[PDB]
């Protein structure tokens, strides 16, 4: 099974410059308790924007060209990726906006938080049909101290 998890402000932007802007602590939290101990794929900026290996979980990387760092696995397609990952009971799609697109149609979940914040940015997860999917879990938050922007945590499951 393959899921895509991201984080979305409006308008569905999830970067702006190869980063993202905002700094929510929980989301980050919610992050790591879903991926843990599961293969993570990401296409090369997002390897490049995270800077380093993703501890406790196999981190496979897409790109067209050699990788350049043997803490993680390269691979040069989706089904080649996908492989990578074994038989293991699900499959962590972290991005970035290019790998979304081409992981979608596959997904049978999808792990959105949407965030209450507005920037401007380069970079959107794709357009969803929303007939497509059940909504079987969220979780609203306000702002605090730690975390500056309002969230929902959602879960979709494919219909
Ligand atoms: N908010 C969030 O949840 C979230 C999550 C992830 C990322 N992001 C943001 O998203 C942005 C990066 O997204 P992006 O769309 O620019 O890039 P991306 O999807 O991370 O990476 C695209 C690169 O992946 C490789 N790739 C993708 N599909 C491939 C395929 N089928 N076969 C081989 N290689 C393939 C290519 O690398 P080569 O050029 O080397 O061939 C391509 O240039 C950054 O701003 C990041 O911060 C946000
Ligand atoms: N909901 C969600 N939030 C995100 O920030 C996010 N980020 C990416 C890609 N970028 C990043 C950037 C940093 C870290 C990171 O530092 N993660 C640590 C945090 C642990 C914690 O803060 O508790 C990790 O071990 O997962 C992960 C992904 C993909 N999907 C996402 N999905
Ligand atoms: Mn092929
Ligand atoms: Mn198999
Ligand atoms: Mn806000």
Redesign the pocket.
């Known amino acids: 099974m393959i899921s895509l998890i991201?984080?979305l402000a409006v308008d569905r932007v999830?970067?702006?410059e190869?980063?993202?802007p905002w700094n929510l602590p929980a989301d980050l939290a919610w992050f790591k308790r879903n991926t843990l101990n599961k293969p993570v794929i990401?296409?090369?900026?997002?390897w490049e924007?995270i800077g380093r290996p993703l501890p406790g979980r196999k981190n496979i990387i897409?790109?067209?060209?050699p990788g350049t760092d043997d803490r993680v696995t390269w691979v040069?397609?989706?089904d080649e990726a996908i492989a990578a990952c074994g038989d293991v009971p699900e499959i962590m799609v972290?991005?970035?906006?290019?790998?979304y697109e081409?992981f979608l149609p596959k997904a049978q979940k999808l792990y959105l938080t949407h965030i209450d914040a507005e920037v401007e940015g380069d970079?959107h997860f794709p357009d969803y049909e929303p007939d497509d999917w059940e909504s079987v879990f969220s979780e609203f938050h306000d702002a605090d101290a730690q975390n500056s922007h309002s969230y929902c945590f959602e879960i979709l499951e494919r219909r």
């Open positions: 991201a984080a999830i970067g702006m190869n980063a993202m990401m296409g090369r900026h997002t924007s897409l790109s067209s060209q040069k397609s989706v972290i991005g970035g906006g290019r790998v081409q970079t």
